[PDB]
Amino acid sequence: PRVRSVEVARGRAGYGFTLSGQAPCVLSCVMRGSPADFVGLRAGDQILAVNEINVKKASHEDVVKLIGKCSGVLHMVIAEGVG
Numbered sequence: 001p002r003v004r005s006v007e008v009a010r011g012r013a014g015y016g017f018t019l020s021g022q023a024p025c026v027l028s029c030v031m032r033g034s035p036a037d038f039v040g041l042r043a044g045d046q047i048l049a050v051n052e053i054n055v056k057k058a059s060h061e062d063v064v065k066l067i068g069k070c071s072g073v074l075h076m077v078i079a080e081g082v083g
Helices: 060-068
Strands: 003-008 046-050 072-080
Touching: 046 060, 060 072
Parallel strands: none
Antiparallel strands: 003 072, 046 072
């Protein structure tokens, strides 16, 4: 039970998973088969850092902006709560 990082390889139209965290950035769910699942993403992992910058209570648009700026791959630091 600790914090880790995941490297997602953005394809062409994004990745496939879903993001929803007005305040507490969290991966609502992932689509098995996308570059996100290829690393080992599992819905529930709370997003702490996005693009090397923390986002405990950041803005949804700002967080998305960072992910849509990867230009090939994004570095997200999430923590597994259950399991």
